[PDB]
Design a protein around this ligand. Structure first.
Ligand SMILES: N[C@@H](CSS)C(=O)O
Ligand SMILES: [Fe+2]
Length: 187
C-alpha cells in the first residue's frame, strides 16, 4: 500500500515481493517503484553478462513464482523480434544506455506488412509498460557505441512467446532461454 523509494536493487526486490503478494497487480504502482529505483551499476554488475552476437536475458529473481525479474544486456545494434507477452504484464526499466521501442498492432489474419503504430526512445531510469491488450513491440539498441542494460519484470512468468514476421504478420512460437540465473552462467 505505502510505496517507498527503493534504496538499492535488493530493496527494490523486497518491495516487489510485497507488491506481488496477492493475486492481482497494481500496474501504476509497480511502474512507479521501478522508475523510483536509481540504477546503481555496482548492484547489478553480477547479472550484466553480455554476448557478442545477440542480447542476453539474465534471471535475477523468481518472485516466489508470481513474476520473473531479469536483466537484459544489449550490445551495440542488438535488438529483439516483434513479439507479444503471453498474456502477462511486462515492465521494462532502463539501467544503462537507451533503447528504441517500436509499437505494432496485432496483425489481421490476412498476410500484410506490419506498419509501426509509433516509437519512443526509452532513456536511463525510465520504466515502460506493455501487455498484449496494448499491442506488440520490438525493442532495439540502435547505438553504435553504447551497450544498453534493461531490467524487465514479467507477471505471471512465461518462457514462451510469439515472434512476428514484419513483412507478413505471420507468427512463430519461440522458447525463451536464460543466459544466466542468479549470476551463474547457464549454458
Ligand atoms: N520481452 C522481451 C524483451 S523486450 S520486453 C524478452 O523478455 O525477451
Ligand atoms: Fe517485450
Amino acid at each position: 500500500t505505502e510505496l517507498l523509494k527503493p534504496r538499492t536493487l535488493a530493496d527494490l526486490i523486497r518491495i516487489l515481493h510485497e507488491l506481488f503478494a496477492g493475486d492481482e497487480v497494481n500496474v501504476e504502482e509497480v511502474q512507479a517503484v521501478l522508475e523510483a529505483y536509481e540504477s546503481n551499476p555496482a548492484e547489478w554488475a553480477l547479472y550484466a553478462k553480455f554476448d557478442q552476437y545477440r542480447y542476453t536475458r539474465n534471471l535475477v529473481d523468481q518472485g516466489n513464482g508470481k513474476f520473473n525479474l531479469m536483466i537484459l544486456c544489449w550490445g551495440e545494434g542488438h535488438g529483439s523480434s516483434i513479439h507479444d507477452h503471453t498474456d502477462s504484464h511486462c515492465f521494462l526499466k532502463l539501467l544503462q544506455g537507451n533503447l528504441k521501442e517500436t509499437l505494432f498492432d496485432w496483425p489481421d489474419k490476412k498476410s500484410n506488412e506490419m506498419i509501426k503504430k509509433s516509437e519512443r526512445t526509452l532513456r536511463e531510469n525510465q520504466c515502460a509498460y506493455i501487455n498484449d491488450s496494448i499491442g506488440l513491440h520490438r525493442v532495439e539498441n540502435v547505438s553504435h557505441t553504447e551497450p544498453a542494460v534493461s531490467l524487465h519484470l514479467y507477471s505471471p512468468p512465461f518462457d514462451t512467446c510469439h515472434a512476428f514476421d514484419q513483412r507478413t504478420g505471420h507468427k512463430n512460437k519461440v522458447t525463451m532461454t536464460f543466459h544466466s540465473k542468479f549470476g551463474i552462467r547457464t549454458p
